[PDB]
Amino acid sequence: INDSGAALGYYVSEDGYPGWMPQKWTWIPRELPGGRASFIHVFEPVEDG
Amino acid sequence: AQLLAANEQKFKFDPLFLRLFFRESYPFTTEKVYLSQIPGLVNMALYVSPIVSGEVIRSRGGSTSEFTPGYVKPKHEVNPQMTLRRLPDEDPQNLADPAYRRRRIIMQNMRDEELAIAQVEEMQAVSAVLKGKYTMTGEAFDPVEVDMGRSEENNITQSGGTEWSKRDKSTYDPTDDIEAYALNASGVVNIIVFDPKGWALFRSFKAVKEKLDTRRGSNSELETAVKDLGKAVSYKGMYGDVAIVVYSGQYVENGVKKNFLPDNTMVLGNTQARGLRTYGCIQDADAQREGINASARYPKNWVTTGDPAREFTMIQSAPLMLLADPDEFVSVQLA
Amino acid sequence: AQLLAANEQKFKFDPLFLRLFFRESYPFTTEKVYLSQIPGLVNMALYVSPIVSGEVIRSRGGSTSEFTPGYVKPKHEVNPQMTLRRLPDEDPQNLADPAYRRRRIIMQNMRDEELAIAQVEEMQAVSAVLKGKYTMTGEAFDPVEVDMGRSEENNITQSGGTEWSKRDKSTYDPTDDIEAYALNASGVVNIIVFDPKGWALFRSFKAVKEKLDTRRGSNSELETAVKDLGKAVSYKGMYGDVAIVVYSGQYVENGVKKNFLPDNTMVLGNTQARGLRTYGCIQDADAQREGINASARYPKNWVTTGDPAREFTMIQSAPLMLLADPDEFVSVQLA
Amino acid sequence: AQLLAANEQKFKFDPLFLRLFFRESYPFTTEKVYLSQIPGLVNMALYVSPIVSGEVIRSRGGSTSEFTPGYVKPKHEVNPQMTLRRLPDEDPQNLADPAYRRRRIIMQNMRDEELAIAQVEEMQAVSAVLKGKYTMTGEAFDPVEVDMGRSEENNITQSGGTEWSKRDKSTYDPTDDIEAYALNASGVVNIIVFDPKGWALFRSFKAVKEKLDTRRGSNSELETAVKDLGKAVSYKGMYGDVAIVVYSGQYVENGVKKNFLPDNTMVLGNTQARGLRTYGCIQDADAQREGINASARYPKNWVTTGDPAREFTMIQSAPLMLLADPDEFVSVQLA
Amino acid sequence: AQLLAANEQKFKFDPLFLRLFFRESYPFTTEKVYLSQIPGLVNMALYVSPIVSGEVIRSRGGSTSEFTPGYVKPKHEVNPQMTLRRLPDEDPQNLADPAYRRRRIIMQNMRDEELAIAQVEEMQAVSAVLKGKYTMTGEAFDPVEVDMGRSEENNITQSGGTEWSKRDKSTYDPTDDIEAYALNASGVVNIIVFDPKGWALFRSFKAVKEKLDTRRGSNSELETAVKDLGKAVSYKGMYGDVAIVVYSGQYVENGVKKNFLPDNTMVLGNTQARGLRTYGCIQDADAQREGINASARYPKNWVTTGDPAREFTMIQSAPLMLLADPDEFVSVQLA
Incomplete structure (x- = not known):
């Protein structure tokens, strides 16, 4: 995120099934600039930030 | 710390002693061995008159019923700091996991563990059927001599009188000594397993070498046993009537290695001699509250929190294997 | 330039040293060998009182843990300009391809490569179990002496005192010397492999020739090993108790060929002596970014663009095989 | 038991040794220190002809690369049974919590812990640059002498020949001895830090007292260092060319306290001498499975369940700090 | 392979020679140095009559204008196989990257590189102002002697006639020799920088020690220069009129280390002597097609594809630094 908190993207660790895959973190933006909803991250925040 | 069920080997390859002479396992819920408790041989002759029947027959009260099992834990x-045994090229990426x-290293650790208890059990077996005495001993532990009762005629020696080394290497036949030692064995002898140089001076006699049959002439499952354990049991062949085997097994002690077998020894007896595997209590709270107080072995994987904050594999057992009939085998030291 | 997977041989035929005494492979992700890191023999006796358990047991800190593996690449x-090895009449039209x-010539090239590293490894083995010293050396490289620690009684000489050449060729028995050198070997000796003329003057004694058994009397898998490598290991037969073998292997050096073995030498020890195959880092960017920094060998086929605009097969390894117990073998120079 | 991140001090106030001479930290993933592994000083002169370039340059193989780090844990x-250090009137209601x-007492406990390891490290430093020898020792541990290699001319003594006590207290100038001991120091000396009475008899000479400049004449950041550690380092002033300091630090041992410094000693050398802080493995399962096997320090807060059912703060480290050039400092015992 | 702009040091700490006497850099687009091309000192006196003006004034045609710069590349x-210099605990997770x-190791590599060229340049400087001769030499390269033209009175020796060692250590004043050698120096001398033992026997005279002022009396920025390079330049103090310095810098050659300075030598001259840093062509296709044929230094990071399929950091330069006036310094070998 930025200093203002705007969620830019995410680091997706690699799957762990079977219980012996290592995790590697991959970049995923929250949404495309044109308004396209690529990574739909829906959560209820109890407070700011 | 992984569960109890992660204890799969399917590797039971003991050298023909605990699997062939000493099948007679008796794990107990009680500490010691109580030979009076074991039925052993049953009072097995008397009938009753054709009017009514007689009294109640029990386990016939073994005279000595108190010895300390070798509780070995x-x-x-x-610790996942080693590079492990890498079987050829099965994707070392999972080793990187x-x-x-950790799971295949607990596999390796525990297998080392049961083969350790197996090799100490084989030393117990070789002491047992070579002298009838076993030394239940260890530091911070009193040495208890556990005696099956091997008789003097079961301990008669070849060096007494005339030695095979001090005989004609060409015309003398040690078969005469073979039945001489076999007669007072309380049965028929069908394996003549030697230690290496013992078999060497046995076969040094010509009569032996043109009396023995090198052919298979497959008599029993002993050939299958040798094919299984092609390591230290060597099926020399047929001596005609009897099978000729040589055991050259070795134990690798604290700093050195040496053979299980002494220099020149022999035990004459049957392949179906009765061997007891009495097992004591297992002193592990897990074992008691899940009922493994009476069993063969107990593994566990477990984490220590605090000073030795680590994780270990623990193996616990308590064997006191003996022979039911010490007189079944005649133990001879050779020339 | 062909892929990594084009490295199929199924040809592992090392002369009974790296396969029988030195099975104990330890490829590392780190440059040197760290004998402190290898567990080796484990501190393997002490138990704890039947109240609580004791401290944590580690790899027992090897005193010397720094030697340079022989990184051989x-x-x-x-280059498809040769006519190749043509196995009899399997359609030379594909050779015309x-x-x-190119593929079967990379096969031939790489097999030459691993047999090269195998023969240099066998020279390392013969230096190791003949003197306990190994010369990690090469031009533009400092000579490091890697010593397992072979003792003086493991280097006692037959020429000292009375020589077998300076003995009765008919009545003298060198068996006395056999146990004399075997007693201080920290174990039992079961192979008496000689170099050729060493076995020649060994057998020159009559007592040897009427004490040895020419018969099979198949003791172990050593007969199978000889049948496999019928090239330079020769199973002479039984000396009764012990097996008699002769190694006449030869290395073909830069301009000439000569035997691996010196004139008249012997090593007395077991067939199950512990041999370490510690392996260093593999200095290849491919190996690091695919995790073959800790492995045995690494092949590759690869094209150079520019001045040497060609294509090559490259083999990389880093062995520093040694013996865990140098005292296990007594090394004797013969008469 | 509180998390690892509760290890915030921002208090690094070591007495000018581990921060000024011994900045050169080398925590390892391996047990020992391998001076061959450390590049140290690089082979740093040769070029190649203007046609092609030469061979590959390595870490130039340190002769001795095996010493045991002081793994101190x-x-x-x-235990929340004490009344704690109450900083003046910051709401003792939270102490009542x-x-x-518990959190500020783990703060206090752990800070005591790193200052303990810091003071033992400073004793190691004073042994190191006062004799070139360090005693890696402790009960239930073999005493290893770790020697950087301090030369004899670096151990020449003032009492030999003529003593400063046995000299004119008014006219004799010890500056002559100052350059006499500084010449064989492999560099320039710019701090003349004494132990107290050593500086006392140094300044007893008048020539010293009218040669020294009491003024600031701020030369470097050493004044800032003294202002920081106004405890035991005392910036006496300028002796003109060179800085005059006195260290009177004290360690409070098991039952008593005494100064770090011996009675009358000196080390002549630079402020930029190269000091290695090689660090060994950290033997904590947490450290290995989170990769803190190669680091400086490791704290933890942790609960024991069972017999010592309590909660503790544990600090683990393994320093083996030494000096790269023992010849850099001339160590003199004074009159 | 990383871009050219990854060449940020801000570390220019040459020992007061290339920064204070030899500021006069002349990188060329042409191979050699053409002293006729350099204006150097300009014909700088004549005017013209108050009617018209005279001819055109040029660069006054240096007599010798052909020497080979030391093109050092x-x-x-x-290779990302090392553990690197770990500055204390700045998140080794990025080192794990x-x-x-790779980026901070190219930082370390390249800084080693320019300090290498700097130390070889300092050897060139010490040869230059100690004898006026420089050996442009290397294997597979002809040795060109580059002479500025140091005169005989600039090479007069202290051992000739009466030596300072062969003088009164108490009453003799070497100041007389100081002006004796300073008079034929074509200027004023304001630094008397010695090699260590040279200054030792200089100060052995009492007159020196009560004539010199140990006080700061800060004359110029030379104190700031010493504070910057507190390594090997040592500001002894004031000798009254002149500054007393000692250089004890050392170069670490292929297998050993030794001081830059000979046993006992001196150069008498000014701090503002004119030093040329003529620089030749840079033989790198990148440098030519981007116009770095005329510059100081050139770094690059670059990958080789093929046989040495790797990645390297390459540093290229071509200095031929000399002194404009060899007569400016009188070079004396001491007693």
Whole structure:
């Protein structure tokens, strides 16, 4: 995120099934600039930030 | 710390002693061995008159019923800091996993553990059927001599009188001595397993070498047993009537290695001699509250929190294997 | 330039040293050998009182843990300008193909490569168990002496005192010397493999020739090993108790060929002596970014663009095989 | 038991040794120190002809690369039964909280811990640059002498020949001895830090007292260092060319306290001498499975369940700090 | 392979020679140095009559304008197989990154590179102002002697006639020799920088020690220069009129280390002597097609594809630094 908190993207660790895959973190933006909803991250925040 | 069920080997390859002479396992819920408790041989002749029947027959009260099983509980670490045994090129990426490294290293650790208890059990077996005496001993533990009762005629010696070394290497036949020692064995002898140089001076006699049959002439499952354990039991062949085997097994002690077998020894007896595997209590709270107080072995994987904050594999057992009939085998030291 | 997977041989035929005494492979992700890191023999006796358990047991800190593995990376060309090894009449039309010629010539090249590293490894083995010293040396490289620690009684000489050549060729028995050198070997000796003329003057004694058994009397898998490598290991037969073998292997050096073995030498020890195959880092960017920094060997086929615009097969390794117990073998120079 | 991140001090106030001469930290993933592994000083002169370039340059193989780091892992209890250090009147209601008492008491405990390891490290430093020898020793541990290699001319003594006490207290100038001991120091000396009475008899000479400049004449950041550690380093002033300092630090041992410094000693050398802080493995399962095997320090807060059912703070480290050039400092015992 | 702009040091700490006497840099687009091309000192006196003006004034045609610059282009590898210099605890997770390890290792590699060229340049400087001769030499390269033209009175020796060692250590004043050698120096001398033992026997005279002022009496920025390079330049103090310095810098050659300075030598001259840093062509296709044929230094990071399929850091330069006035310094070998 930025200093203002705007969620830019995410680091997706690699799957762990079977219980012996290592995790590697991959970049995923929250949404495309044109308004396209690529990574739909829906959560209820109890407070700011 | 992994569960109890992660104890799969399917590797039972003891050298023909605990699997062939000493099948007679008796794990107990009680500490010691109580030979009076074991039925052993049953009072097995008398009938009753054709009017009514007689009294109640019991386990016939073994005279000595108190010896200390060898409660052996070693352990090791499976700390994921090593590179492990890499079987050829099965994807070392899973070794790179701490999960797979830790599970197959507990596999390796525990297998070392039961083969350790197996080799100490084989030393117990070789003491047992070579002198009838076993030394239940260890530091910070009193040495108890556990005696089956091997008789003097079961301990008669070849060096007494005339030695095979001090005989004609060409015309003398040690078969005469073979039945001489076999007669007072309370049965028929069908394996003549030697230690290496013992068989060497046995076969040094010509009569032996043109009396023995090198052919298979497959008599029993002993050939299958040798094919299984092609390591230290060597099926020399047929001596005609009897099978000729040589055991050259070795134990690798604290700093050195040496053979199980003494220099020149022999035990004459049957392949179906009765061997007891009495097992004592297992002193592990897990074992008691899940009922493994009466069993063969107990593994566990477990984490210590605090000063030795680590994780270990622990193996616990308590064997006191003996022979039911010490007179069944005649133990001879050779020339 | 062909892929990594084009490295199929199924040809592992090392002369009974790296396969029988030195099975104990330890490829590392780190440059040197760290004998402190290898567990080796484990501290393997003490138990704890039947109240609580004791401290944590580690790899027992090897005193010397720093030697340079022999990082050997040779290469060759597989330039499709040769006529190749033509196995009898399997359709030379595919040899006419540059594809088949190039693939089976990389086959031939790489097999030459691992047999090269195998023969240099066998020279390392013969230095190791003949003097306990190994010369990690090469031009533009400092000579490091890697010593397992072979003791003086493991280097006692037959020429000292009375020589077998300076003895009765008919009545003298060198068996007395056999146990004399075997007693201080920290174990039992079961192979008496000689170099050729060493076995020649050994057998020159009559007592040897009527004490040895020419018969099979198949003791172990050593007969199978000889049948496999019928090239330079020769199973002379039984000396009764012990097996008699002769090694006459030869290395073909830069301009000439000569035997691996010195004139008249012997090592007395077991067939199950512990041999370490510690392996260093593999200095290849491919190896690091795919995790072959800790492995045995690494092949590759690869094209150079520019001045040496060609294509090569490259083989990389880093062995520093040694013996865990140098005292296990007594090394004797013969008469 | 509180998390690892509760290890915030921002208090690094070591007495000018581990921060100024011994900045050169080398925590390892391996047990020992391998001076061959450390590049140290690089082979740093040769070029190649203007046609092609030469061979590959390595870490130039340190002759001795095997010493045991001082793996120090002490601990304490933070049992919430004490009244604690109450900083003046910051709301003792939070001290009444077990949460705040426990967290700031783990703060206090751990800070005692790193200052303990710091003071033992400073004793190691004073041994190191006063004799070139360090005693890696402790009960239930073999005493290893770790020697950087301090030369004899670096151990020449003032009492030999004529003593400063046995000299004119008014006219004699010890500057002559100053350059006499500084010449064989492999560099320029710019601090003349004494132990107290050593500086006392140094300044007893008048020539010293009218040669020294009491003024600031701020030369470097050493004044800032003294202002920081106004405890035991005392910036006496300028002796003109060179800085005059006195160290009177004290360690409080098991039952008594005494100064770090011996009675009358000196080390002549630079402020930029190269000091290595090689660090060994950290033997903590947490450290290995989270990769803190190669680091400086490791704290933890942790609960024991069972017999010592309590909660502790544990600090683990393994320093083996030494000096790269023992010849850099001339160590003199004074009159 | 990283871009050219990854060449940020801000570390220019040459020992007061290339920064204070030899500021006069002349990188060329042409191979050699053409002293006729350099204006150097300009014909700088004549005017013209108050009617018209005279002819055109040129660069006054240096007599010798052909010497070979020391085109030095070394390189190294930055292969991400090492653990690197770990500055204390700045998040070794980025070292775990190949990206950060590779970038700061190219940082370390290249800084070693320019300090290498700096130390060889300082050897060139010490040869230059100690004898006026420089050996442009190397294997597979002809040795060109580059002479500024140091005169005989600039090479007069202290051992000739009466030596300072062969003088009164108490009453003799070497100041007389100081002006004796300073008079034929074509200027004023304001630094008397010695090699260590040279200054030792200089100060052995009492007159020196009560004539010199140990006080700061800060004359110029030379104190700031010493504070910057507190390594090997040592500001002894004031000798009254003149500054007393000692250089004890050392170069670490192929297998050993030794001081830059000979046993006992001196150069008498000014701090503002004119020093030329003529620089030749840079033989790198990148440098030519981007116009760095006329510059100081050139770094690059670059990958080789093929046989040495790797990645390297390459540093290229071509200095031929000399002194404009060799007569400016009188070079004396001492007693």
